[PDB]
Each structure stands twice: as C-alpha cells, then as structure tokens.
Design a binder for this molecule. Structure first.
Ligand SMILES: OC[C@H]1NC[C@@H](O)[C@@H](O)[C@@H]1O
Ligand SMILES: [Ca+2]
Ligand SMILES: [Ca+2]
Ligand code: NA
Length: 438
C-alpha cells in the first residue's frame, strides 16, 4: 500500500563526506606526499616515475575536499603543494596522464582558492609537456617526455593521448592571456578530424611523426573516448564553433555506423573506419562515459538507452565487469580498477532535467562500492568479482580521489559551494567552471 521510505539525500551526502574524510586520514597516516595508497597493506606506490613521487592522490583530492567543506584538509594539501611540489625532475612522464591528473588537479584547486602559486605550478608543468608537441612536425604529442630535459619517447599514440588537452590548456590560456596553449591543443585535434573517412570516422591509433593512422579500428572506447568529450567541452567552456560542429558530426557518425543491438541492448563495438564492418566484440566499463556525452550533445534518448546497458550489468554482476563480450553479455576479466564511469554518466544526464532516477541508480553504485571495496586504510580495486565475497587487490587509484566521491556528493548534496548551471568537469572530474565563493 504505502511507499517504501524516500531516500534522505542530504543524509546520504553527509555519509559520502564522512567516508571521504576517513579515507583522507588513511592517506595522511600511510602515504603522505606519495602518489597512491595501497589501503589493504597500508603502504604506498609511485605512479609517474618509480622512486620520485609527485603527490598524485593529494593533488587529485584537492577540489573534492573544497567542494565538501573539508577546509582544514584542503588547506593542508595546498600547503604541502606550495612547500614541496617541483617538476624539475630527470625522468619520463606520460604526457596524457600528467595533463589530466596534475595540470587539471592544480587548475581546479587554483579556481577554488584563488592561490596564484597553484596556477604558477600548473603553467610550469604545461610548458614541460609542450616540448612533446614541439617534437612533432604535425603538433601531435609524443607519449612520454623527460620533465627536465625535454627528450621524447614513443610516437605510436592514439586519439585520447593526442586529444585530451584542450580543456586544461584552454583554461590556462584564459587565465594567463597566452593563446599558445589553446592553439597547440586544438591543432592536434584538427589533424585527425581532417583525416576522417567518407563515413565520418577516425581510426583510434595515430603516429606522431608520420601523421598517419596505424590501425583501421574506429572506437568510442579506450584509446579514443575523451577526444570526443573534449570537442563538446571546448564549445561549452570557450564557445569554439569548430569544436561544436565536430562534436555533433563525430557522434552522429558513431550512431550511424557503430551503434549495434545484441540481445535487445545497445552497444558500440569497434568497426573498420572506412567500411563499417565490425572488427571487435569487446566493450570496457570505461565506455559508460559516452551515455553522458550523448545527452550533452542533444541525443538524450540514445544516452539513456546506452546507460540502460550498464544498469543491466550492475543489476546482474553487482560491480560492472571491467570488460565484456557484447555478443554474450559475459565478463572477459574478473578484476576491476575501482572505476568511476557509471556515476560520471549519471551526474551528466541528471544535470539536464534533475530526474530523480539518476540519483537512485548512483545510490546503488555508492552502496555497492561500500559493500565490496572498503579496506583497513581506504578503498581498493578488486581481484575477482565472481567470488562471494568478492576478493580484493591492494590499490586506491589516483582518479578515485577526483571522480566518483565527487560525483556522488554533487548528485546528493545540492551544495551552495557550486553553481550547478555553470558547472563544467574535465575527463578527470576537475571542476573548471562553477565554484561559488564562500
Ligand atoms: O577510469 C578512470 C580513468 N579513465 C581515463 C580518464 O578519462 C579518467 O576518467 C581516469 O584517469
Ligand atoms: Ca574520463
Ligand atoms: Ca565529460
Ligand atoms: Na581533482
């Protein structure tokens, strides 16, 4: 007869904040200044350069701490950065990961606080990454660069690793007045878009020196994914008319040639970029970001249909498998990366009309994370989703500190610290617009 008791969303937001503060205390105790905590053993690891940590998880956490009103914790992290974080290091850093995690994490912390030193450090790092773009006659970045010397390595790259810079670099250009950052990021994206096939698709794999594709596989998934996000995000952040056009053209080519149904559910397998023949049967969990991008570009019904494929994986397996075979619906791997893309899609679709269904689905995902990944000193990736209980690995990935706890808190809290109508998030969930003073 009566309804089951309605969710108290403010109480659930307070629980997310409590858990985030508890995890931060574990990082301070076991991994202070180090890149990642291993929260089962209570130890740390490096991410970018073995033996030369750069405070990765501390930097990733900063904007999340501020949004939650964890102000003492935020200021302790900012003060560590200002005293300790140098990028004058004789070692190789992966250009893509360094931009989205460290340049973006310093920019969101700068926008929250106003502190000039955080902008100075973001810009210093971007100038070291610029050497990877300058080493290509096409302006396509090499995958790795030595932060001190500018030496490059590995030009056999991909759309995500040449095309996930324009949000962070374009905000640098706005704040500093120097257009060079925006221009270098946009030039790399134009290169691959100019090489689209007659059916409107790009292959995912590209060589920085020849400028030619090195496979025939078009993908929406890993090695391509965030290129398509950053086309739309550059329209939203900068008003760039080329990027607005390109975002819509690329998505409608993918809907025409990659959207396929298997057992009644929508998937986007890999296809030959010229002929449209299917070339893969795998889909990763990370492809769930695309449900939210579909809604952003004006394809909400199709975005909700794709989200439903992942909702069915969550209801069936509890945790979404890291990879599935689309022809059967069954897992290709048993381990996970404590991945954030399902609540990413839920937040992006919820920002359109505030439909409470997206809150219900994200609450299932948060509660499942608490039931499976909680460890002695924080939250961990999984070894095997098929055992009962699910067995645990021993690592908290840096992106956990920027992404899913922020997504849950934004969905549940209605915080006055954010202007929800102006909110813009990077592919690492760094807030690049929408802070309100308080
Ligand atoms: O899976 C989370 C991981 N995926 C690649 C990036 O887009 C970002 O979401 C994060 O580093
Ligand atoms: Ca992402
Ligand atoms: Ca996005
Ligand atoms: Na962050």
């Amino acid at each position: 007869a009566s309804e089951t008791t309605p969710e108290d969303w403010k109480a659930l937001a307070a629980d997310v904040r409590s858990e985030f503060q508890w995890a931060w205390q574990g990082y301070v105790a076991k991994a202070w200044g180090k890149d990642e905590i291993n929260p089962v053993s209570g130890t740390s690891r490096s991410f970018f350069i073995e033996g030369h940590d750069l405070g990765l998880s501390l930097v990733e956490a900063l904007d999340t701490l501020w949004i939650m009103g964890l102000d003492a914790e935020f200021q302790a992290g900012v003060d560590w950065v200002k005293a300790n974080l140098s990028f004058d290091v004789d070692g190789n850093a992966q250009v893509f990961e360094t931009n989205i995690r460290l340049v973006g994490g310093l920019l969101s912390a700068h926008l929250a606080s106003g502190d000039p030193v955080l902008l100075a450090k973001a810009r210093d790092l971007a100038d070291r990454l610029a050497k990877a773009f300058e080493a290509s006659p096409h302006g396509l970045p090499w995958r790795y660069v030595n932060l001190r010397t500018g030496a490059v390595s590995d030009p056999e790259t991909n759309l995500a690793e040449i095309g996930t810079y324009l949000s962070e670099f374009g905000v640098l250009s706005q704040l500093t007045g120097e257009r060079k950052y925006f221009d270098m990021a946009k030039r790399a994206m134009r290169h691959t878009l100019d090489r689209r096939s007659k059916i409107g698709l790009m292959a995912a794999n590209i060589h920085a020196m020849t400028g030619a594709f090195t496979s025939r596989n078009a993908s929406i998934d890993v090695y391509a994914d965030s290129f398509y996000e950053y086309l739309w995000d550059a329209w939203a952040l900068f008003g760039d008319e080329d990027c607005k056009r390109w975002a819509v053209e690329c998505v409608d080519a993918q809907l025409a040639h990659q959207a396929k149904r298997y057992d009644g559910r929508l998937w986007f397998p890999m296809v030959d970029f010229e002929t449209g023949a299917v070339t893969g049967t795998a889909q990763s969990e990370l492809a769930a970001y695309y449900a939210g991008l579909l809604g952003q570009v004006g394809r909400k019904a199709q975005g909700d249909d794709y989200l439903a494929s992942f909702t069915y994986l969550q209801a069936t397996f509890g945790v979404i498998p890291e990879s599935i075979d689309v022809t059967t619906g069954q897992p290709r791997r048993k381990h996970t990366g404590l991945r954030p893309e399902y609540p990413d899609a839920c937040l992006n679709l919820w920002l359109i009309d505030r439909d409470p269904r997206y809150r219900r689905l994200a609450a299932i995902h948060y509660r499942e994370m608490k039931a499976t990944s909680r460890a002695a000193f924080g939250y961990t990736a999984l070894k095997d989703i098929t055992t009962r209980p699910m067995t645990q690995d021993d690592n908290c990935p840096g992106y956990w500190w920027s992404e899913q706890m922020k997504y849950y808190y934004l969905l549940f809290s209605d915080t006055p610290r954010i202007d929800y109508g102006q909110l813009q998030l990077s592919t690492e969930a760094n807030v690049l617009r929408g802070f309100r003073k308080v």
